Amino acid sequence: APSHLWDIMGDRQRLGEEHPLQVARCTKIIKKYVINLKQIAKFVVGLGERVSPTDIEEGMRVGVDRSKYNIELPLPPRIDPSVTMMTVEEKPDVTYSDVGGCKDQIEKLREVVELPLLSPER
Amino acid sequence: IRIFRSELQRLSHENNVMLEKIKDNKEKIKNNRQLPYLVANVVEV
């Protein structure tokens, strides 16, 4: 059912010659951008159509077109590691009141961690 | 006397006519230059 609504855009978001982009990283910036590919190949191009001159930064992954290389959209850096994506947890089951006792070792951790996050102006 | 001074004035006029042809050739060079240069390592001169 949800696939039928996305097939209408299939005449644009699919058959277009833009989307087949080659991802790479710009090694050198001259304000001419030296960009190194994943195949151990480099080239030099300029800005794109919607590309802003201040968006491209030194040492950032920048996707380019597959046929005629041109900067199209920037991408966040450090795309290689897949390991740290699973290190972030969500909603731990242990709550704040699960630690037994009134011991002051609890008060020391909340003031050095929870306090500056909740009340940074204190 | 007038012959020596006439050849020097017409010399700059002939260079100005050829100057427009060189400027047209420079535009052809700029047109022949495309953004990707790739990269090549020069191992010998």
- Nearest by Cα to A46 from A34, A61, A60, A37: A34
Would you state the structure tokens that stand for residue B36, as one six-digit string?
Answer: 């990707």
Residue spans of beta strands (DSSP E) within A21-112: 21-29, 33-36, 42-45, 61-65, 71-74
Experimental method: cryo-EM
Taking the C-alpha atoms of residue A29 and residue A46, their distance in angstroms, rounded to an integer, is 10
**Looking at CA atoms only, how far is residue B40 from chain A in angstroms?**
9
CB A44 within 8 A of CB B35: yes
Residues in chain B with CB shorter than 8 Å from the CB of A34 are 39
CB A60 within 8 A of CB A26: yes
φ, ψ for residue A110 (rounded to 5)?
-70, -30
Question: Which amino acid does the sequence have at A82?
Answer: S
Residue spans of beta strands (DSSP E) within A50-117: 61-65, 71-74
Residues in chain A with CB shorter than 8 Å from the CB of B35 are 44-46, 70
Taking the C-alpha atoms of residue A4 and residue A2, their distance in angstroms, rounded to an integer, is 6
